[PDB]
Amino acid sequence: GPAVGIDLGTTYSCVGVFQHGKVEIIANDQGNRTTPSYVAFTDTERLIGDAAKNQVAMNPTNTVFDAKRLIGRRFDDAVVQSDMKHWPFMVVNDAGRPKVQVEYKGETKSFYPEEVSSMVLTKMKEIAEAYLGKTVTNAVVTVPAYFNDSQRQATKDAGTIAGLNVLRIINEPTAAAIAYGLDKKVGAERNVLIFDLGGGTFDVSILTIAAGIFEVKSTAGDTHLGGEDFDNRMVNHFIAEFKRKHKKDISENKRAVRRLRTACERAKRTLSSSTQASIEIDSLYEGIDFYTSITRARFEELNADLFRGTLDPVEKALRDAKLDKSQIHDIVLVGGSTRIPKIQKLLQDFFNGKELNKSINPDEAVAYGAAVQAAILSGDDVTPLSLGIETAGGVMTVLIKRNTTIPTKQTQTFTTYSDNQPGVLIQVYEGERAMTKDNNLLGKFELTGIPPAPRGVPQIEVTFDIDANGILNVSAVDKSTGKENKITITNDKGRLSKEDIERMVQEAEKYKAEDEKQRDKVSSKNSLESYAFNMKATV
């Protein structure tokens, strides 16, 4: 029946379905609402999920994880070459593509990243089918906002290989926002910050939501930071405590270290709801029982640099988004590590007491939003686009920002690009791109009769006026003579579709850097030439 949402996560994945007016996150065959994204190959079998993760220490070279770090990349990508150094499994280059290479039933086999991820998705699919008692075909799968076209397409292929029809690939932060219904809040646009701290990765995203349209303003984070690091601080703390008390270093013994790590992970979880946790390990090393405890404050101190460090990407995202912290309407906590009270406090204090949206299980929120969107996709007055004119060099100079309420009037003053320019061409464009080449021309007209003056002297006042019915009147006035000309541009056609708008916004995002570079290339901001830049011959 219904399509499922799937958070295909770096360490674990989660699947959910919107039914009977409610999202249900679906437990797997061991009763777990999240499934490790792990695939293991053995002499006899292929394990996926919990079974895979549980045996990793017995079969590490054959147990694959972190495929999401490879997916859609090229073997010689610096990220891949750096990541490979920390993985026990082999990654090899097949005609430029990374493949993970393993031993399976006594033979060497290799898989593309999207094949591995497809195996994880097959597991989630089957989990969903067990729960629903029917075949699951359609799905929405989520990816990090920073994923490029290659990574998105490879994630989609992973879905296709698994027998899923992927209705849409959507951004994790967007999923999170949908989960909290921040898109249904419609009113003036809202700036949302998604703070996603998982086991292995930390992503910060700033979105602006206007009229149901999500725009990613900025992304930042740390691809190497998560709960495991916090666990690791406690582990090392306790190794040192043991060495200090018993004069033995247990690091030599792998299993002892494993047992310690497990205990610290549990303790860390306890410290989110209690101010202390007890560690009890029988015969940790050399027959010595380790029974001790740790306070929340001590855990916080052990982590202080890591925790306080999470604010740095928040700050950078705010800068890149050209927003003051006070301009953030909604803060969303995603990822298990946001359960940590110090993290929540650090963040709330940074935001001056502002309340965080935490109520949805932070491990499940992305899947939740995905499930909602899947449901919608299986079924379940303001300006649509920025409006501006061409200025010298073909650059788009915006008079009215997308999603401005109408009626509206906006005026800006422009000048001439060259000496003794007799006229200016007023070329009215609509779109989110920096260069008019990439936007849509709605109309054009000339203001002639400009008295000869040095470049930059004449003052031409341009006015964009939109009435309640959305009819756009654009006029230019020579401020020295009062002479004027204008054009009327007819819009309400039902000519743009919500999808068109999302598309344009997303492309404007994809191209942001190139656009900026080309934007600030031209010296003066308000200069108008006498010709259409995009009709001018180039090589």
The secondary structure of 380-400, three-state, reads: CCECCCCEEEEECCCEEEEEE
User: How would you classify residue 211: left for phi > 0, otherwise alpha for psi between -120 and 50, otherwise beta?
Assistant: left
**Structure tokens given for 405:** 């309420």
Q: Are residues 246 and 217 in the same domain?
A: no
Query: Pick from 303, 320, 339: which residue ends a domain?
Result: 303
* Neighbour order of strands in the sheet with 472-478: 484-489, 472-478, 460-466, 408-416, 527-528
Given 303, 324, 353, which residue is the final one in a domain? Answer: 303
Pair 453, 395 in one domain = yes
Residues 6 or more apart whose CB falls under 8 angstroms from that of 324 comprise 318
Angle value at C-alpha 387, between 427 and 473, nearest 5 degrees = 70
Contact present, 464 and 441 (Cβ < 8 Å): no
Ligand-binding site membership of 12 (annotated): yes
* List of residues 6+ apart from 43 with CB closer than 8 A: 105, 106
Residue-wise DSSP of 55-112 = TTTTSGGGEEE-HHHHTT--TT-HHHHHHHTT-SSEEEEETTEEEEEEEETTEEEEE-
Q: In the chain, after which residues is the C-to-N distance over 2.5 Å, breaking the chain?
A: 380
Same structural domain, 160 and 267: no
Cite the DSSP H helix spans in 351-484: 365-377
272 annotated as ligand-binding: yes
Give whole-number Cα distances, 510 to 181, 210, 242, in Å: 25, 19, 52
Cβ atoms within 10 Å, residue 38? 27
Q: Is there a domain that residue 254 lies in?
A: yes
**Shared-domain flag, residues 122 and 27:** yes
Whether residues 167 and 252 share a domain: the answer is: no
My answer on whether 495 and 420 are in the same domain is yes
**182-210 exposure pattern, b = at least 16 Cβ within 10 A, e = fewer:** bbebeeebbbbbbbbbbbbbbbbbbbbbb
CB 195 within 8 A of CB 309: no
Task: Specify the experimental method.
Answer: X-ray
Rounded (5°) CA angle 80-85-88: 110
345 is in an annotated binding site: no
DSSP 171-236: EHHHHHHHHTTTTS--SS-EEEEEEEE-SS-EEEEEEEEETTEEEEEEEEEETT-SHHHHHHHHHH
Say how far apart CA 447 and CA 424 lie, in whole Å: 5
Judge if 174 and 189 occupy the same domain: no
Cβ atoms 517, 381 nearer than 8 A: no
By C-alpha distance, which of 234, 237, 282, 228 is closest to 255? 282
Structure tokens at 68: 């999401």
| Residues whose CB is less than 8 angstroms from the CB of residue 40 and which lie 6 or more positions away in sequence, other chains included | 46, 47, 48, 51, 52, 55, 56, 59, 62, 63, 64
Q: How far apart are CA 21 and CA 19, in angstroms?
A: 5
Q: Are residues 81 and 129 in the same domain?
A: no
Q: Cα dihedral sign for 399, 481, 528, 534? A: positive
Strand partners, 316: none
Q: How far, in Å, CA of 401 to CA of 410, rounded? A: 10
In 3D space, the residue among 307, 470, 264 whose CA is nearest the CA of residue 385 turns out to be: 470
Distance CA 37, CA 44 (A): 20
User: Do 87 and 131 belong together in one domain?
Assistant: no
Q: Give the sheet arrangement for strand 46-48, strand by strand.
A: 46-48, 38-41, 63-65
Q: What are phi and psi of 240, to 5 degrees?
A: -60, -45
Residue 168 shares a structural domain with residue 214: no
Active site residues per annotation: 7, 68, 172, 196
Q: Is 10 annotated as a binding residue?
A: yes
Q: Which token pair is 379?
A: 């079924």
In a domain, 166, yes or no: yes
Round to whole Å and give the CA distance between 375 and 154: 23
What's the distance, CA 504 to chain centroid?
Answer: 18
Distance CA 269, CA 230 (A): 11
Torsion of Cα atoms, 30 then 32 then 36 then 39, to 10°: 20
Q: Check residue 187 and give left, alpha or beta (phi > 0: left; psi -120 to 50: alpha).
A: left
Which element (helix H / strand E) includes 243?
helix 227-246
Determine whether the annotation assigns residue 271 to a binding site.
yes
DSSP H helices, 247-364, are 254-273, 296-302, 304-309, 311-320, 341-350
CB burial class (10 A; 0-12, 13-18, 19+) of residue 322? exposed
Question: Domain tally for the chain?
Answer: 5
Token match 């666990």: residue?
Answer: 231
Structure token digits, residue 208: 């602006």
Q: Return the bridge partners of 191, or none.
A: 208
Is the same domain home to 473 and 525? Answer: yes
Instruction: Report the length, in residues, of the chain.
Output: 539
**Distance (Å, rounded) from C-alpha 312 to C-alpha 309?**
6
How is residue 479 written in tokens?
């401020």
CATH number of the domain where residue 277 is located:
3.90.640.10
- Using alpha carbons, list the distances in angstroms from residue 290 to 79, 240, 253, 274, 396: 40, 13, 15, 21, 68
**Which residue from 40, 93, 45, 47 is spatially nearest to 62, judged by alpha carbons?**
40
Angle between helices 172-179 and 365-377 (to 10 degrees): 80
Would you say 463 and 413 are in contact if contact means Cβ atoms under 8 Å apart?
no
The reply, when asked if residue 265 is annotated as ligand binding, is yes
Range of the domain at 97: 65-111
- Considering the domain architecture, whether residues 398 and 353 belong to the same structural domain is answered as no
Q: Reduced to 3 states, what is the DSSP secondary structure of residue 296? A: helix
Q: Report the 10 Å Cβ neighbour count for 463.
A: 16
